[PDB]
Design a protein around this ligand. Sequence first.
Ligand code: UDP
Ligand code: NDG
Ligand code: MN
Length: 309
Amino acid sequence: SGSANFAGVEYPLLPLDQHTPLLFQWFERNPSRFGENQIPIINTQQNPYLNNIINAAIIEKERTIGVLVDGNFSAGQKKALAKLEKQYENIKVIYNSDLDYSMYDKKLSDIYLENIAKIEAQPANVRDEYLLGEIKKSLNEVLKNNPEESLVSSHDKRLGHVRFDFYRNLFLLKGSNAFLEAGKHGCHHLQPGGGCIYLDADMLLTGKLGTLYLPDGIAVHVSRKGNSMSLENGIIAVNRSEHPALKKGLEIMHSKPYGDPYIDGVCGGLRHYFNCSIRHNYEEFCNFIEFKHEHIFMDTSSLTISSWR
Ligand SMILES: O=c1ccn([C@@H]2O[C@H](COP(=O)(O)OP(=O)(O)O)[C@@H](O)[C@H]2O)c(=O)[nH]1
Ligand SMILES: CC(=O)N[C@@H]1[C@@H](O)[C@H](O)[C@@H](CO)O[C@@H]1O
Ligand SMILES: [Mn+2]
């Protein structure tokens, strides 16, 4: 199968076979902008994401296609989604609220208290006095209004990319298991502990993906703007659930007072897992870890307009 090297460690290229499900995500924070019986997934002329999901489902006829949705949909919008599932056998709509994420959760007061103890152990002359005060204010705010506030409940409140970025990582930790948890029947060759290929709805398929070969079975989008490249979470491919790199990102989220689902849960998890230290070469890590496929036209929203920026 081969292997690829980074930072003196050789990682086998593990296969994601052609039955690894694709995952699209659509979190709608104002579903009343859609018809009461319309499919609550944007499908404008500028952002034809529903059509893009349909088309990928038509190309990958044999592949399971998850659509993780969330929002306060009307009963009729949910029936519309159900009608979608019956039009395209391989499309499986999963309601985020139907999934149990508590095994990944942690109380904010415990995160805060853990950081306070470490920082307070440093004497006043060298400690980050500003940060310590910010964490104390955060903890105090939690204890005054919602002492059982946790990572999950806290992100539940923060509508926007921060929240759907957060659940994207948690769903990928479940991997194929999420389809089984959600009770989606007839997912061909889907196995517990199996993986998943997440794609932004503007990542256009133009042909079958076939089998992927990724270093330790993971790869992510690497975006290029001007002359720069950055790790991105617009594509996340894992060959298994609980991928140790995404788990490390969750661990970072569990120890950092202000963990970002993208910066820490994805970029941070990948870099620690592969030991891409601030001393190592970031461009070398990007090339090593990049998700590449000639049959995906990537981040097409940048050609028109973002759906949320
Ligand atoms: O209201 C929104 C906007 C975006 N997204 C998700 O965010 C992804 C990225 O969307 P887009 O490409 O428009 O944003 P950008 O590339 O500018 O970050 C989409 O595919 C969806 O999965 C979402 O769930 N709800
Ligand atoms: C092409 C790409 O990487 N898009 C991602 C998007 O999916 C994500 O939600 C957003 C916020 O973290 O960052 C990036 O724009
Ligand atoms: Mn985009």
